[PDB]
């Protein structure tokens, strides 16, 4: 269970960055550890990109900053780019050599991702005796502080 | 009896042991006696000498 | 109420170790009675204590990572806990790398 | 019970007047009453000549 | 009772009118009434000729 | 609930304008597609917010 899912936009001399944070409550009987990673395959987040396209990037393909799940819009100075003229493989963008001196702009979707930054309640406890033969110790849900994976971006597990 | 309490178990909260069937048989034998007195009847076969 | 709500802990009582250097005032790092801490501990005592807000408190530093986490504890009756007294919770295991 | 940001509240069917199984027992007593009326119609009224 | 934000709270079956075992005693009295009716049908009414 | 409580707005979606200077990385100030902002906007969409 996840709460307070903030984007946390930052605008810097180096460029934009996301430092957003969320609060997570785990299932029972789990020991989450620092920098453990979560992905939420149901939830897709919008992001934007722009690249200048040059002979090297034509031959080698543009390595995308984000782990693009799908493209919602792609365009250039000459207009929209049609799906026969671009391809994504291995999170590389390949373009028709037609565009050897153009800049391409994209809107994309990617899966939501988090890393465990800190643990706000790492232990909660209960001895349970009712209807048990003897007292059983049980570990109640942890509260996690989750930070978004902007700076270093890794593929989805599958 | 248990069929009429489908989805319930009677269980000692200090041990988790279910109640023994001996109590069920005891209660049934007394319930038959009660039924044989609420109505002026003999349910179970027996030889009577009068 | 406290015996119902608290977790079982081992309490051991702090005192300054008599290994402190009579001039510099610092502990001997090889002392067996205290492993370089200035504080020695008496034999453990079994008690129950109720504990709240058990935060890990991760820090990331140029020297490396460190934990500075903090919690709030409510003692049993009629106890005089003293500074730097130490508790361990044998039921509760924490992951580390 | 409230502990470290977990809170639970329960109201039970037990009360200072009624026991936890009051409702089921009342319904069973209604069923018994219907059955007994039927069976006391099947067997007749007792009578004797003085 | 509350200490340092831990809260524990009870409402019991006791009350200013009813004792802790009120409901069970009431049910036992109902059962006694049924049993006595049955047994007072088995043994007869007392009578004497003056 | 949202349709009752919200005001009608026109929403238009951001994207970076392809007029950015391929070296300096800054927008062309004369660009007609974006009036000196680095961000171009898609056609408006009617929504309630
Ligand atoms: Zn020492
Ligand atoms: Zn007859
Ligand atoms: Zn007589
Ligand atoms: Zn422009």
Give me the DSSP letters along chain A.
Answer: -EE-----EEEETTEEEE--EEEEEPPTT----TT-EEEEEEEEEEEEEEEEE-HHHHHH-EE-SS--SEEEEEEETTEEPPGGGEEEETTEEEE-GGGTTEEEEEEEEEEEEEEEEEEEE---EEEE-TTSSS-EEEEPPPEEEEEE--SS------
- F and D adjacent (3 or more CB pairs under 8 angstroms): no
Contact B39 D46 (CB under 8 A): no
- d(C-alpha A34, C-alpha A41), whole Å: 21
Q: Do A and D touch, counting CB pairs below 8 Å (3 needed)? A: yes
Cβ proximity of A86 and A93 under 8 Å: yes
In three-state secondary structure terms, F48 is strand
Experimental method: cryo-EM
Distance from C-alpha of D50 to C-alpha of D46, rounded to nearest angstrom: 13
Asked if D36's CB is within 8 angstroms of B39's CB, the reply is: yes
Question: How many separate helices (H) and strands (E) can be counted in chain C?
Answer: 1, 8
Taking CA–CA distances from C72, the nearest residue in chain D reads D4
A130, closest residue in chain B (CA to CA): B13
Give the span between the Cα atoms of A118 and C60, in whole angstroms: 11
Q: Resolution to 1 decimal, in Å?
A: 3.6
Closest Cβ–Cβ partner in E6, E22, E27 for D16: E22
In sequence order, the β-bridge partners of residue D45 are: none
Which of B38, B39, B42 is the mutation pick for testing E, counting most E CBs within 10 A? Answer: B38
φ, ψ for residue A131 (rounded to 5)?
65, 15
Q: Is D3 on the interface with C (CB under 8 A)?
A: yes
The C-alpha atoms of residue D45 and residue E45 are separated, in whole angstroms, by: 17
Nearest C-alpha neighbor of A49 from the set A32, A63, A38, A31: A63
Q: In D, residues 20-49, which contact C (CB 8 Å cutoff)?
A: none
Residues whose CB falls within 8 Å of the CB of residue D46, separated by 6 or more in sequence, listed in order: B40
Nearest alpha-carbon partner for A147 in A23, A16, A26: A23
- Alpha carbons C15 and C42: distance in angstroms, whole number: 8
Say what the alpha-carbon torsion angle A98, A104, A106, A111 is, to the nearest 10 degrees: 80
* Structural contact between residues A142 and A119, judged by C-beta atoms closer than 8 angstroms: yes
Distance, CA D32 to ligand 2 centroid (Å)? 23
Inform me whether the C-beta atom of residue A69 falls under 8 Å from chain F C-beta atoms: no
Residue with tokens 């989750």: A146
Instruction: List all residues of chain A from 83 to 142 with a beta carbon under 8 Å from chain D.
Output: 121, 124, 140-141
CA distance C57 to A117: 10
Buried b / exposed e over A69-91, threshold 16 CB at 10 Å, is eebeebbbeeeebeeeebebeee
In the 8-state DSSP scheme, what is residue C82? Answer: -
Cα A152 off chain centre by: 10
E4 touches chain C (CB under 8 A): yes
| Cβ proximity of A6 and A79 under 8 Å | no
Interface check for D39 against chain B (CB to CB < 8 A): the answer is yes
Q: How far is CA B35 from CA B2, B46, E39, in A?
A: 20, 16, 12
**CA–CA distance, C49 with C87 (Å, rounded to integer):** 10
Q: Which of A121, A116, A112 is nearest to A146 (CA)?
A: A116
**What whole-number distance in Å separates Cα of residue F48 and Cα of residue A57?**
42
- Token pair for C81: 């806990």
**What size, in residues, is chain E?**
50
D14: number of CA atoms within 13 Å, CB side?
13
Q: Does D5 touch chain A (CB under 8 A)?
A: yes
> Count of alpha carbons within 13 Å of A77, Cβ hemisphere only?
16
Half-sphere exposure of A60 (CA within 13 A, CB side): 8
Closest CA to A97 of A71, A131, A60, A128: A60
Are C91 and C7 in contact, with CB atoms under 8 Å apart?
yes
Q: Which two tokens stand for residue A127?
A: 């001895």
Q: In Å, how far from its chain's centre is CA C89? A: 10
Residues, Cβ < 5 Å to ion ligand 1: C 17, 19, 31, 33-34
């Amino acid at each position: 269970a996840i709460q307070s899912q903030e984007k946390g936009t930052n605008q810097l001399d180096i460029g934009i960055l996301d430092t957003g944070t969320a609060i997570g409550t785990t299932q029972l009987e789990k020991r989450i550890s620092y920098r453990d990673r979560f992905t939420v395959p149901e939830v897709l987040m919008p992001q934007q990109m722009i690249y200048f396209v040059n002979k090297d990037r034509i031959k080698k393909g543009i390595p995308l900053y984000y782990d693009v799940k799908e493209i919602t819009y792609i365009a250039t100075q000459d207009g929209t780019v049609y799906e026969e003229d671009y391809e994504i493989k291995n999170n590389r963008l390949y373009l028709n050599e037609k565009y050897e001196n153009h800049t391409v702009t994209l809107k994309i979707l990617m899966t939501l991702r988090y890393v465990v930054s800190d643990i706000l309640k790492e232990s909660r406890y209960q001895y349970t005796k009712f209807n048990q033969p003897k007292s059983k110790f049980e570990n109640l849900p942890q509260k996690l502080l989750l930070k978004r994976e902007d700076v270093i971006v890794l593929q989805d597990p599958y | 009896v248990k069929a009429y309490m489908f989805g319930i178990v009677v269980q000692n909260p200090d041990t988790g042991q279910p109640m023994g069937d001996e109590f069920y048989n005891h209660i049934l034998e007394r319930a038959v006696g009660k039924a044989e007195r609420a109505l002026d009847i003999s349910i179970l076969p027996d030889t009577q000498h009068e | 109420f406290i015996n119902d709500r608290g977790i079982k802990v081992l309490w051991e009582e702090a005192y300054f170790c008599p290994c402190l250097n009579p001039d510099t005032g610092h502990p001997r790092v090889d002392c067996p009675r205290c492993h370089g801490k200035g504080i020695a501990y008496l034999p453990p005592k079994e008690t129950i204590m109720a504990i709240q807000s058990q935060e890990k408190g991760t820090n990331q530093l140029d020297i490396g990572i460190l934990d500075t986490g903090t919690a709030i504890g409510t003692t049993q009756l009629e106890k005089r806990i003293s500074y730097r007294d130490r508790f361990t919770v044998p039921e509760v295991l924490m992951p580390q790398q | 019970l409230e502990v470290d940001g977990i809170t639970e509240t329960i109201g039970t069917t037990q009360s200072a007047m009624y026991g936890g199984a009051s409702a089921q027992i009342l319904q069973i007593n209604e069923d018994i009453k219907e059955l007994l009326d039927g069976l006391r119609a099947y067997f007749g009224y007792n009578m004797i000549g003085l």
